[PDB]
């Protein structure tokens, strides 16, 4: 139709109370005039307020005595969130007490499994890891590594090539590898 949509549409109501046709009509026309009564405003109003989903402050009429002049009174109330007010979109917890390990979970999850899988191997962890760590300390035999290096690819269901190895001389290498390779 028009802008003039909205008020129109207000319009129609008005007229359907004073059971005439809403085309013929001055749209300078005071409410007063109209027949708009308080008791009929009112419900007017509160169909306003639920049909266009906003709140009119009862004194529009009272300053707005023209009902074309009345929408400044009704666009303004149209709430500013109604489109953008998704709280969560695939967010599992609507609250924040830490987005740590919450959120890098796959990071700890894989690193503690990864030394679980590497302990297990080597027997024993001679400490608690070392942030560094040669060839030497994943065997004496490329075994070790092979076998390792495959079960963290297929247990994280991760294609990781076994050629990759000769790449990474050092234990942290692949931990961060692996997590970059999933994420």
Same mark, same amino acid.
């Given at each position: 139709?028009?802008?003039?949509?909205?008020?129109?549409?207000?319009?129609? =109501?008005?007229?359907?109370?004073?059971?005439?046709?809403?085309?013929?009509?001055?749209?300078?026309?005071?409410?007063?005039?109209? @027949? &708009? %009564?308080?008791?009929?405003?009112?419900?007017?109003?509160?169909?306003?307020?639920?049909?266009?989903?906003?709140?009119?402050?009862?004194?529009?009429?009272?300053?707005?005595?023209?009902?074309?002049?009345?929408?400044?009174? +009704?666009?303004?109330? &149209?709430?500013?969130?109604?489109?953008?007010?998704?709280? +969560?979109?695939?967010?599992?917890?609507?609250?924040?007490?830490?987005?740590?390990?919450?959120?890098?979970?796959?990071?700890? =999850?894989?690193?503690?499994?990864?030394?679980? =899988?590497?302990?297990?191997?080597?027997?024993? %962890?001679?400490?608690?890891?070392?942030?560094?760590?040669?060839?030497?300390?994943?065997?004496?035999?490329? !075994?070790?590594?092979?076998?390792?290096?495959? @079960? !963290?690819?297929?247990?994280? =269901?991760?294609?990781?090539?076994? %050629?990759?190895?000769?790449?990474?001389?050092?234990?942290?290498?692949?931990?961060?590898? +692996?997590?970059?390779? +999933?994420?």
């Amino acid at each position: 139709v028009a802008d003039d949509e909205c008020a129109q549409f207000l319009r129609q =109501s008005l007229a359907a109370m004073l059971y005439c046709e809403p085309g013929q009509i001055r749209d300078g026309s005071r409410f007063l005039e109209l @027949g &708009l %009564d308080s008791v009929i405003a009112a419900q007017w109003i509160r169909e306003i307020n639920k049909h266009y989903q906003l709140k009119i402050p009862a004194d529009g009429i009272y300053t707005y005595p023209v009902f074309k002049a009345f929408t400044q009174w +009704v666009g303004t109330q &149209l709430q500013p969130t109604q489109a953008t007010a998704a709280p +969560v979109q695939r967010e599992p917890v609507a609250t924040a007490p830490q987005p740590g390990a919450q959120a890098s979970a796959q990071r700890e =999850s894989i690193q503690d499994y990864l030394k679980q =899988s590497l302990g297990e191997l080597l027997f024993l %962890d001679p400490g608690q890891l070392r942030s560094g760590a040669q060839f030497l300390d994943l065997g004496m035999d490329s !075994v070790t590594g092979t076998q390792w290096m495959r @079960g !963290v690819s297929r247990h994280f =269901s991760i294609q990781l090539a076994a %050629d990759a190895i000769y790449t990474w001389p050092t234990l942290k290498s692949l931990a961060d590898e +692996v997590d970059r390779r +999933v994420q």
